[PDB]
């Protein structure tokens, strides 16, 4: 079609088209011969609005032309994807083979029938005491990390990816890792860690940087999840999906939304943000009759550390708990800087116990939690009283709380803790406290 009529920002108006579909992909043949890809945002009567990924510079309208491709964003799937790196459209970034796909799938996916899902059952050893014990990740769960700019979620993410294993007989997790709008530095950290550890031979990477077009940013998670469902639900694999940084996904959303001239809802973000988010995070779980599964760990920075911000708020309504990193902990050299009190896993119950973990999991977990709560309270009240409100019976909680943070939670981003070691440490810690602190007959069994 030689009919470009308007170019406004990164948007194009194309006239006298027909057969054109919403979200359909297009190619621009520019007057110099250059080709740019784009996507239909709007389509009315015989005209169509397109956005161009690589922006709109250099174009002479009169002498360009658009081709309509007859299919939206798709992923060319195949098992050969394991061990590879792509950009946020699925194009190779590792100078390896051109992958001959099995088929091309719409990256929007399809919604899982609510009565088709299976309850998540099996405990995932992340090897991080604070999650494994106090906020257990379970296979098929959606459990995100809420962090802030500057905070080492990056490190936490790589660690979960290296260490995550099930206690079963397999197979190993396949990791699908989606980087979304991150700096080259962030991304280069991930890709070297994965190469270093050999975690790549087990992974599929989708890398999309900050200087990448905001639409591609938007596509990135949908690409990764399409890959993950394919590996899981067609190839019977257990897939662990890690995504950073969802805040970036959101920022990209406002950008396109502004461009489509939409009208923002709560706190500047789109009305449809919720549906969008759920649309991502519900692509997860076990399915009846199917061997494979998808477990999500979305990662996101909380704007101005604000819990009520739409991004963390809506994510919380959709996911089954969350893991929080605080600045108070990070600055105090604690790694991983997980605050347990606001952290939660909703599916932990059936995931743990005897034959999952050990007979004492729940018990220590509640006690450690309650004890830590009292210790923070002792330290907080050391502002006014300073000392002497805890002469004997309450001294210990302050000390406890300190060491709980220093030994138990702070474990190092390269330290892999078996659930045995985690639980053991927790008792070796609870021992500080006098037995009048209630454990059961088993207070004398694990002592």
């Amino acid at each position: 079609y030689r009919t470009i009529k308007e170019v406004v920002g990164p948007l194009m108006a194309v006239e006298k088209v027909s057969g054109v579909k919403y979200e359909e992909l297009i190619e621009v043949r520019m007057q110099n011969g250059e080709i740019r890809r784009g996507q239909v945002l709007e389509v009315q009567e015989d005209k169509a609005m397109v956005q161009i990924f690589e922006g709109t510079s250099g174009i002479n309208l009169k002498n360009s032309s658009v081709r309509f491709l007859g299919h939206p964003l798709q992923l060319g799937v195949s098992e050969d994807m394991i061990g590879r790196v792509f950009d946020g459209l699925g194009r190779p970034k590792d100078n390896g083979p051109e992958i001959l796909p099995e088929k091309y799938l719409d990256i929007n996916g399809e919604v899982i029938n609510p009565i088709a899902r299976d309850y998540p059952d099996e405990f995932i050893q992340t090897g991080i005491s604070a999650i494994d014990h106090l906020n257990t990740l379970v296979r098929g769960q959606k459990l995100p990390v809420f962090s802030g700019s500057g905070l080492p979620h990056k490190e936490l993410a790589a660690q979960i990816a290296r260490q995550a294993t099930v206690l079963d007989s397999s197979d190993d997790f396949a990791v699908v890792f989606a980087a979304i709008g991150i700096t080259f530095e962030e991304a280069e950290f991930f890709m070297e860690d994965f190469r270093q550890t050999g975690a790549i031979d087990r992974s599929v990477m989708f890398m999309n940087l900050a200087n990448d077009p905001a639409i591609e940013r938007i596509a990135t998670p949908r690409m990764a999840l399409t890959a993950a469902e394919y590996l899981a639900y067609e190839k019977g694999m257990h897939v662990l999906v890690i995504m950073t940084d969802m805040t970036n996904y959101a920022e990209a959303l406002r950008e396109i939304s502004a461009a489509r001239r939409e009208v923002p809802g709560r706190r500047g973000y789109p009305g449809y943000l919720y549906t969008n988010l759920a649309t991502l995070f519900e692509r997860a779980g076990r399915i009846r009759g199917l061997k494979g599964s998808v477990t999500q760990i979305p990662i996101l920075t909380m704007p101005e550390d604000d819990k009520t911000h739409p991004i963390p708020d809506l994510t919380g309504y959709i996911t089954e708990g969350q893991i929080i990193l605080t600045r108070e902990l990070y600055k105090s050299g604690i790694q991983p800087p997980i605050d347990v009190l606001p952290s939660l896993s909703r599916l932990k119950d059936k995931g743990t116990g005897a034959g999952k973990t050990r007979e004492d999991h729940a018990a220590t977990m509640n006690q450690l939690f309650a004890a830590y709560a009292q210790g923070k309270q002792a330290k907080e009240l050391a502002v006014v009283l300073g000392e002497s409100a805890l002469s004997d019976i309450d001294k210990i909680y302050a000390k406890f709380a300190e060491r709980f943070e220093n030994e138990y939670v702070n474990q190092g981003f390269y330290t892999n803790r078996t659930i045995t070691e985690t639980l053991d440490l927790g008792w070796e810690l609870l021992a500080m406290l006098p037995r009048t602190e209630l454990r059961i007959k088993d207070d004398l069994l694990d002592k």
């Binding site: 170019v7 007057q31 510079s57 002479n60 500057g150 200087n211 939409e262 500047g268």
Partner: protein, 583 residues
């Protein structure tokens, strides 16, 4: 093709009959022929963002495309110049216009096309060359070699070539390509909105020797890394950007004054030709490029300066140099994006700023970093982005700072009560951070065979202890405070007033050598640690402070120690082990 103005509404101008042109094409607007860029096109009608004031212009006047996007000339006679936003050199401006004032419509080549330069050829005839290959060089300065590279988009062999004296317009090289013969000059143009291509980005892992104690020690930036400097008015940012600019072990400085004060720009061309790098012994200007778009200059050209700067920085990066780029202030650039977006009736983002703000900042900070430049030689280069930010009310929660801080790894926060209470440089040792600390740790401790990172950790830990004891003095009082904790304050006192504090207009405290830094901190670190050992042996805190006053505050004047030979403060350590055997 003659265009014709159909609408003038502020910096925005609309012209019919513009169909032969392209989006982003620069064009001459009106009878004045003012500089403008096409940003939209509906049919034959171009919307133009004008980089000069449009007052006195109206419908019916002509508009001509240049058929070229916003570009810079890249070649010799760039180093040491002062350009405006769109790369017009300000001194030639003065001369051609016989005026002390920015007049509209003026058209200038950025570089002196008449100057004879000496081309020393370096590649022999018959070599396969492609983008980024050095064919010869020019001694542009005393120190800097202007290395002449094949432009991007050229491929083939060197047909003819010779050393000689030429202008930048004279063809110095002939290449037989795939199309045919193409002759190159010492000059190339580049569109500023497009990052110059590279082989690949590298992880920036070597520390900047700024010499500014606080920065190098607690909040280091790597070569290729990026720092932010946000703060209120009267923070001192300016008297700090200078310090970075003068001492960093880089090869070139690109110092971009985006929409700040005019006077400050003069101060630069006054004080930089006087700022002599010892050893090299030639002025700082000899290694600096200035771009100035002052606060009362056209708003639309604020975004022009930012891109002009960084594109120039990319050029020298490509020659295998380390460059530093200073953008000041990046708030005024975002302010210019806010204004255009309003005029274009776009959907606003936070605080009115456009929804593509973050992207813009991202597109900019990612053009910085450490690379492997193009060319067979596979040479390696870097750009180090230092940006001043000027948030409303000095409040950092603002969108420009928040979007910057999610793409940069270094934050040098300027407080008000520091500058107001004479603590230079005004840097928030609590709030600030460098996510390079860890990696720079590995680098130093290994370069010194020392435990310098362990020292760094211990110092920061002491400043973070002092922080909560100060909010505890705000209770019962200093009088009732324990021995070991009384010591914690007087070690922090030392760090604040002695280490962190630095004078820019002093003959020796303006810069601190890497090893001079290492000794000072150790001189502090043994003092604190050994006075601790006197407390756990039964000597009261008071006895220690009265016990050493002169020799303890010989460390107070130890920031003023020169360097006749290298060894200077390599003395106080075995001299503290004296009073620990006495007191």
């Amino acid at each position: 093709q003659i265009g014709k103005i159909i609408k003038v509404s502020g910096p925005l101008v609309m012209a019919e009959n513009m169909s032969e042109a392209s989006i982003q094409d620069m064009c001459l607007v009106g009878d004045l022929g003012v500089i403008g860029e096409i940003i939209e096109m509906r049919q034959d009608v171009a919307s133009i963002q004008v980089y000069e004031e449009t007052s006195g212009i109206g419908p019916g006047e002509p508009v001509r495309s240049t058929g070229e996007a916003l570009s810079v000339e890249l070649g010799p006679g760039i180093i040491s110049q002062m350009f405006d936003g769109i790369q017009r050199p300000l001194d030639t401006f003065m001369e051609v216009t016989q005026s002390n004032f920015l007049g509209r419509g003026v058209q200038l080549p950025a570089l002196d096309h008449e100057k004879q330069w000496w081309f020393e050829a370096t590649i022999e005839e018959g070599t396969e060359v492609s983008a980024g290959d050095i064919i010869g060089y020019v001694d542009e300065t005393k120190i800097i070699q202007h290395k002449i590279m094949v432009p991007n988009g050229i491929k083939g062999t060197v047909q003819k070539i010779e050393s000689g004296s030429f202008t930048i317009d004279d063809p110095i090289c002939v290449i037989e390509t795939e199309q045919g013969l193409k002759e190159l000059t010492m000059m190339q143009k580049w569109p500023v909105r497009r990052g110059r291509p590279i082989k690949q980005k590298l992880n920036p892992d070597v520390p900047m020797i700024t010499g500014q104690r606080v920065i190098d020690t607690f909040f280091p930036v790597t070569k290729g890394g990026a720092a932010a400097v946000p703060g209120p008015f009267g923070a001192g940012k300016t008297v700090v950007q200078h310090q970075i600019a003068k001492w960093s072990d880089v090869d070139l400085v690109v110092y971009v004054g985006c929409g700040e004060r005019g006077n400050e720009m003069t101060d630069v061309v006054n004080e930089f030709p006087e700022l002599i790098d010892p050893n090299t012994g030639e002025s700082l200007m000899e290694r600096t490029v200035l771009i100035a778009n002052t606060s009362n200059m056209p708003v639309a050209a604020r975004e022009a300066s930012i891109y002009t700067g960084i594109t120039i920085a990319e050029y020298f990066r490509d020659m295998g140099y380390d460059v530093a780029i200073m953008a000041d202030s990046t708030s005024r650039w975002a302010e210019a994006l806010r204004e255009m977006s309003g005029r274009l009736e776009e959907m606003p983002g936070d605080e009115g700023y456009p929804a593509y703000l973050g992207s813009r900042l991202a597109e900019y900070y990612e053009r910085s970093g450490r690379v492997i430049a193009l060319g067979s030689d596979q040479r390696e280069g870097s750009i180090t982005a230092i940006s001043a930010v000027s948030p409303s009310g000095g409040d950092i929660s603002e969108p420009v700072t928040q979007n910057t801080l999610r793409v940069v790894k270094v934050f040098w926060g300027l407080d008000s009560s520091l500058a107001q209470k004479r603590h230079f440089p005004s840097i928030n040792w609590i709030q600030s951070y460098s996510l390079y600390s860890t990696e720079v740790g590995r680098y130093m401790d290994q370069i010194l065979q020392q435990d310098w990172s362990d020292m760094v950790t211990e110092g920061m830990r002491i400043l973070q202890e002092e922080e909560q004891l100060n909010e505890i003095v705000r209770l019962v009082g200093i009088d009732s405070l324990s021995d070991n904790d009384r010591l914690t304050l007087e070690v922090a006192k030392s760090i604040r007033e002695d280490y962190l504090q630095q004078n820019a207009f002093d003959d020796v405290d303006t810069f601190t050598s890497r090893e001079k830094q290492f000794n000072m901190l150790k001189v502090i670190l043994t003092f604190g640690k050994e006075a601790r050992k006197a407390l756990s042996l039964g000597a009261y805190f008071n006895e220690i402070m009265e016990g050493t006053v002169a020799v303890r505050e010989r460390i107070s004047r130890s920031k003023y120690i020169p360097e006749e030979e290298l060894a200077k403060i390599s003395s106080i350590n075995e001299e503290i082990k004296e009073t620990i055997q006495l007191i």
